[PDB]
């Protein structure tokens, strides 16, 4: 076009608005490739995600539609903001790709996990995650898919959640899935606190807590560390699941003192010893198999480890106004999704 130019990013073509220069690949997902770029108008670096034929199947479509809608109506410091959205295609018939422009962050949490963090940074990152989750909950959004790769960080320790979480498609969130998602029992808002527990545990010990090769192994990994759950939990399971869970080898589990010893934390000073004890107590309330006994986001935000950062403008921010049942995920055809997405892009 006269407003667009094309650069080759591997085996992929990025056709972007001329305002975006010096494209550099920073990552890839099932949706598409992400480039760092310089925005010459705003005079700041951005991230541009290319969504190739998002309407291609119902899974990509629902995800692309939810991403577009929620990014346009949410304005919270701990949720990635939408700077721009475009398509190089001139019409619906030619419509192929969607490009989402976001603020560029310095790293994702996978990188932070490979660092020892002092409690001030650790507790501030965790506080921000919980604010972002609490904001999603206040609008009726349960993430359910939180993992370190979808959480990004800046140099000044600011944190942002990249996606809104959410079937079959062709060509690693499982480690962070709550027992109620693993055992197909339905879920509440605190399904997200299990994922925070997984992420926090990983930020402390630098290794994936429950690295199951599948859902059966995933359950086995959970029970080995935490122990076989109460009979009160077993009674909440459907008979076919209740039989499978009850017939597994029995595990006593480990105390959080053995799972997360002082050797894994800064614990030299009296300040750090107290923080390590507080961080351990928080881990023990998040990594709870039975969701009815698990910490809520608000109790987590008010926990001694977290509450030093508590700011109601962040933790009690007015909920976003999602234009009704727009994300109910009703089945649509390939062409219906193609139209719904195009209309959201064009506005
Ligand atoms: N540094 C870094 O990982 N940045 C980053 C990475 C993103 C990403 C999103 C999906 C897949 C692969 C990478 S989006 C984004 C951003 N907005 O800063």
Curated annotation (Swiss-Prot):
Activated by threonine and tyrosine phosphorylation by either of two dual specificity kinases, MAP2K4 and MAP2K7. Inhibited by dual specificity phosphatases, such as DUSP1. Inhibited by SERPINB3. The active site is at 145 (proton acceptor). It is an enzyme of class 2 (transferase). Its cofactor is Mg(2+). Its main location: cytoplasm. The keyword Cytoplasm applies. ATP binds at residues 26-34, 49. Phosphorylated by TAOK2. Phosphorylated form is more concentrated at synapses than none-phosphorylated. It is found in: Cytoplasm; Nucleus; Synapse. The modification Phosphothreonine is found at residue 171. Its EC number is 2.7.11.24. GO terms for biological process: cellular response to amino acid starvation; cellular response to lipopolysaccharide; cellular response to mechanical stimulus; cellular response to oxidative stress; cellular response to reactive oxygen species; cellular senescence; energy homeostasis; Fc-epsilon receptor signaling pathway. The modification S-nitrosocysteine is found at residue 110. The keyword Nucleotide-binding applies. One of its GO terms (molecular function) is histone deacetylase regulator activity. It comes from the Eukaryota. GO terms for cellular component: axon; basal dendrite; cytoplasm; cytosol; nucleoplasm; nucleus; synapse. It catalyses: L-seryl-[protein] + ATP = O-phospho-L-seryl-[protein] + ADP + H(+); L-threonyl-[protein] + ATP = O-phospho-L-threonyl-[protein] + ADP + H(+). Belongs to the protein kinase superfamily. CMGC Ser/Thr protein kinase family. MAP kinase subfamily. The TXY motif contains the threonine and tyrosine residues whose phosphorylation activates the MAP kinases. Forms a complex with MAPK8IP1 and ARHGEF28. Found in a complex with SH3RF1, RAC1, MAP3K11/MLK3, MAP2K7/MKK7 and MAPK8IP1/JIP1. Found in a complex with SH3RF1, RAC2, MAP3K7/TAK1, MAP2K7/MKK7, MAPK8IP1/JIP1 and MAPK9/JNK2. Binds to at least four scaffolding proteins, MAPK8IP1/JIP-1, MAPK8IP2/JIP-2, MAPK8IP3/JIP-3/JSAP1 and SPAG9/MAPK8IP4/JIP-4. These proteins also bind other components of the JNK signaling pathway. Interacts with TP53 and WWOX. Interacts with JAMP. This is Mitogen-activated protein kinase 8. It comes from Homo sapiens (Human). The chain holds residues 7 to 362 of 427 of the full protein.
